[model samples]
Target: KYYGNGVHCGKHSCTVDWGTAIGCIGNNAAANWATGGNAGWNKC
Candidate 1:
């Protein structure tokens, strides 16, 4: 597995934040996604 944060997956058609999974919407298709963030620092 990959060790990192703010991992982006799928097309840009979807708007996602930290730990957000953009899938099955606005032609985004079945694209898996996720990420990690801190209280002050956020990964989009």
Candidate 2:
């Protein structure tokens, strides 16, 4: 969502600028579930 949408959650949260990398696969519910539900993705 954040990636495809090109939404930046800020550096305080998303330390890495790879929005699609961390945001897409991290924020994505389907991917999140597929990768074993986890939070605090923006930190990385």
Candidate 3:
């Protein structure tokens, strides 16, 4: 959601910022589940 939607919960619980999210995958939900499911994806 964050990555695809260009949204990010910043340190101050701020709003969406491309600088905070560019090329970086912030706390992604589906990816976390998929990681446990052994899917090939970068989740953290």
Candidate 4:
């Protein structure tokens, strides 16, 4: 159910100076799953 908690910036990864903001549906879980599952933006 918790999704946003799962979405995080990794060590040595580059992100916007402000922060890596993520969005999704069904709750934060959807966001986390999307960040973890997607390759274009989630690839490490």
Best TM-score goes to which candidate?
Answer: 2
lDDT of 1 by residue, 1-44 (tens): 13234443435443344434332231233232222222222312
C-alpha local distance difference test of each model: 0.31, 0.51, 0.44, 0.41
lDDT of 2 at 17: 49
Query: Tens-digit lDDT track for model 3 on 1-44?
Result: 33435555545554565654432343342546523355333432
Model 3 per-residue lDDT at 27:
38
lDDT of 3 at 28: 44
Ten contiguous residues with the weakest lDDT in model 3: 20-29
Sort the predicted structures by lDDT, highest score first.
2, 3, 4, 1
RMSD of 1: 12.6
Q: Which 10-residue window in model 1 sums to the lowest lDDT?
A: 35-44
Candidates 2 and 4 compared: the better one by TM-score is 2
Per-residue alpha-carbon lDDT of model 4 for 1-44, expressed as tens digits? 22235443445464332343433223344556744454444332
Instruction: Pick out the ten consecutive residues of candidate 2 with the lowest summed lDDT.
Output: 1-10
